[PDB]
Design a binder for this molecule. Structure first.
Ligand SMILES: Nc1ncnc2c1ncn2[C@@H]1O[C@H](COP(=O)(O)OP(=O)(O)OP(=O)(O)O)[C@@H](O)[C@H]1O
Ligand SMILES: [Ca+2]
Ligand SMILES: [Ca+2]
Lengths: 350, 125
């Protein structure tokens, strides 16, 4: 029996079957209920008649009734799979409380009657998909960013950092700074358009101050985007100012440390004798790590902060948008997976 | 349950060198006649067991990644490494080995040195 693999993202769900190289289903993590319930793309098409809610906030499930609607949609409308007839691998955020893990487990075994399940930490899956057992994963998604040191297969819980600055903050910041050129993107629909503009046109400067200088000197910075209505928008220094907020959260009025500082701080929480292996294996994961230029910029910034004896290597896998799901697909395919899961009978008799 | 597997049951029982290749999401013994030759298209798990003077056994686990191996193979090699270390009560030291950049310890396991060959077993993906 083939396992189902479900990565529970704040922004999107990724779902499919063990042994595939990519998820077959990717859909927005949205439930709409009338102003019984609609999920994903269909909810966005009926936004005029529905109140829309995100059941996963910063990687943590916070509306369990609506999350159950998402899982039902996943099994019945996306995969067309009987959940009661497949093992299921489900992902969870770093630092997810054990009580939240228990609640998801209860729902799977007692609502969906899954026969067997395994819960996996997202960042660990990503490290495995990169072909490593030791490293530090920087997983930046839609709702949360984490830095997760992992040694010989296992996360080091005392060293994980959570950063409440991720892709949706960057979409909102681009919405904000586009007012400088007269655009007023504000509605939920317009936000999806600006998200697309961000993904298509943004990049990370190697040196922000120098990029500001060079971009002022000509119009070469300017690039164009075709809106749904056919009008063309032109974006300039917003292209690199938007993801600069990852490094300079003050741009968003946040006092948070930037992603370079956070990674450094996370490594420092680990004992001195394993830090070299973490610095030499900084693995990027998630959609918000997809910006052109990120690896070179992170490498400069982390090299500056770290001891000069350390050998900094930032790894940017091409399919990193999906690395959590892919790692789950690999793990759940192994000859040993059947020994890792919890069965329904075991759970019911605990 | 301690995670096991027939190969797991054979691992680390005697001093020596044991090599497995990842094949279709499984850990398959490499024929001993081939030890030291590695397919560039594949990933491998290597356990070196040493008998110390105290009687005890020392374990070093290496996972070797060919330049052409598929993502399923490198990911499985890493996971199997973790699992075999766990089976050995965590007492193995783990080592990532990339084709052409291997440690001198790993190279030193092979009297004829490390050699590579074109090809490999098909991806599971
Ligand atoms: N090419 C790209 N460049 C920049 N950002 C991108 C790109 N592709 C996707 N994103 C952004 O990545 C985010 C989605 O990332 P991801 O799918 O990893 O998050 P998630 O798993 O849904 O959320 P989380 O892990 O935070 O709970 C969105 O903000 C999206 O706009
Ligand atoms: Ca192969
Ligand atoms: Ca160990």
């Amino acid at each position: 029996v083939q396992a189902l693999v479900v990565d529970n993202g704040s922004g999107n769900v990724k779902a499919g079957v063990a042994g595939d190289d990519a998820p077959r289903s990717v859909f927005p993590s949205i439930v709409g209920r009338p102003k019984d319930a609609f999920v994903g793309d269909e909810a966005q098409t009926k936004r005029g008649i529905l109140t829309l809610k995100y059941p996963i906030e910063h990687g943590i499930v916070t509306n369990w009734d609506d999350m159950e609607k998402i899982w039902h949609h996943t099994f019945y409308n996306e995969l067309r799979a009987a959940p009661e007839e497949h093992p299921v691998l489900l992902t969870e955020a770093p630092l997810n409380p054990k009580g939240n893990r228990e609640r998801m487990t209860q729902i799977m075994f007692e609502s969906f009657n899954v026969p067997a399940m395994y819960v996996a930490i997202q960042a660990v899956l990503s490290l495995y998909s990169s072909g490593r057992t030791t490293g530090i994963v920087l997983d930046s998604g839609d709702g949360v960013s984490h830095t997760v040191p992992i040694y010989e297969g296992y996360a080091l819980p005392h060293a994980i950092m959570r950063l409440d600055l991720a892709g949706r903050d960057l979409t909102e910041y681009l919405m904000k700074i586009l007012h400088e050129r007269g655009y007023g993107f504000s509605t939920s629909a317009e936000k999806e358009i600006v998200r697309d503009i961000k993904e298509k046109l943004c990049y990370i400067a190697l040196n922000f101050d120098e990029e500001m200088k060079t971009s002022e000197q000509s119009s070469d910075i300017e690039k164009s985007y075709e809106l749904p209505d056919g009008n063309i928008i032109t974006v300039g220094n917003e292209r690199f100012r938007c993801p600069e907020a990852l490094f300079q959260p003050s741009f968003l009025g946040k006092e948070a440390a930037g992603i370079h500082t956070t990674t450094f701080n996370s490594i420092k929480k680990c004992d001195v004798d394993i830090r070299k292996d973490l610095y030499g294996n900084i693995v990027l994961s998630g959609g918000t790590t997809m910006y052109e230029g990120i690896g070179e910029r992170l490498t400069r910034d982390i090299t500056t902060l770290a001891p000069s004896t350390m050998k900094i290597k930032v790894v940017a896998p091409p399919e990193r948008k999906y690395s959590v799901w892919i790692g789950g697909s690999i793990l759940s395919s192994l000859s040993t997976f059947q020994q890792m899961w919890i069965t329904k009978e075991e759970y019911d008799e605990s | 349950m301690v995670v096991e597997h027939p190969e797991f049951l054979k691992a680390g029982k005697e001093p020596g060198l044991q090599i497995w290749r990842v094949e279709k999401f499984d850990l398959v013994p490499v024929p001993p006649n081939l030890y030291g030759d590695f397919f560039t298209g594949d990933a491998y798990v290597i356990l070196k067991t040493v008998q110390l003077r105290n009687g005890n056994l020392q374990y070093d686990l290496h996972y070797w990644l060919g330049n052409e191996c598929s993502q399923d193979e490198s990911g499985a090699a890493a996971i199997f490494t973790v699992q075999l270390d766990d089976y050995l009560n965590g007492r193995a030291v783990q080592h990532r080995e990339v084709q052409g950049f291997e440690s001198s310890t790993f190279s030193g396991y092979f009297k004829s040195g490390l050699k590579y060959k074109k090809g490999g077993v098909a991806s599971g993906f």
